[PDB]
């Protein structure tokens, strides 16, 4: 059992697992082609975990160190960087553990942007 859970205040909460989905833009990362058209283009990489919700997470990886200019060439005077976001996930507790689920956070790459060293 995650011993860290002892240090969480409060230890447990009551939650309705009937998920209320307010997002009408389904598959928001994979439904657009921004990953291809961006000056800081990226590939999405799939991760699958049966003991996690969401079970499938796609994460961005920048294709280039620099950014792509109007000529279609990489310019190293700027940087392709991944935009990171901390998100909530649920995880399944091991069988010998008290309850079935636990709540925690992970850091994921959502997409990439082009940044200049100094503004």
């Amino acid at each position: 059992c995650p011993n860290s859970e002892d240090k969480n205040f409060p230890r447990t909460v009551m939650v309705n697992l009937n998920i209320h989905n307010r997002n009408t833009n389904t598959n928001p990362k994979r439904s657009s082609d921004y990953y291809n058209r961006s000056t800081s283009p990226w590939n999405l990489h799939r991760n699958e975990d049966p003991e996690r919700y969401p079970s499938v997470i796609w994460e961005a990886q920048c294709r280039h160190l620099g950014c792509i200019n109007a000529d279609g060439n990489v310019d190293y005077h700027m940087n392709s960087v991944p935009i990171q976001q901390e998100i909530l996930v649920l995880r399944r507790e091991p069988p010998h553990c008290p309850n079935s689920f636990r709540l925690e956070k992970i850091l994921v790459s959502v997409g990439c942007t082009c940044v200049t060293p100094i503004v």
Partner: antibody
Amino acid sequence: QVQLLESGGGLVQPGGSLRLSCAASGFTFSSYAMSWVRQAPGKGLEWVSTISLTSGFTYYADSVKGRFTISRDNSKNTLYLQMNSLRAEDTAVYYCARQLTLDVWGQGTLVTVSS
Amino acid sequence: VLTQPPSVSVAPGQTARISCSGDNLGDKYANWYQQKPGQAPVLVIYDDIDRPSGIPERFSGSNSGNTATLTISGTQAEDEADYYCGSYDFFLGMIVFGGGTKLTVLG
């Protein structure tokens, strides 16, 4: 090449027991979740069990809970299905499959339970 | 409990649509499998909208509310098969299948 090969299927009496094996090749077996899916002749697909890549996590359909046991031997790249207390309605072709997406399937092995 | 129509018919070169509906389907990805006679099922769409390498572009997937849909544009005679939708439920810890849909190409 990526491949899954089932074996161990055959005739068994009601109440009998049977162990199925699934030998994997052409990919890093230990990096994937693995599953058993069965299909009765002329019928639809029915998920039997899934084992995670992570040790200690197994999953079962209600109809086989307490009777079937899924396990894996990563050193042998093999998936197993121990089937106990077999019922006539367990008769089906049993498929081995990879990931929760079930992206690669074996050719299947026929389990017949009958007197 | 995923629900598919038992049967769908379509004219050659026309668009085929196969729906799959169930409670809470909107909070998890759906997959689609094609099964021809005497063959193991083949994944044709996963994570709602993604095509495995080797699957023709005419196969497309979509999802709306608690309904997933398999769409085949310009349906060919070789597309005749049984189609199953499937999904993994984290909370129940189960994989669920639809009843399947037999696709018939007319003419």
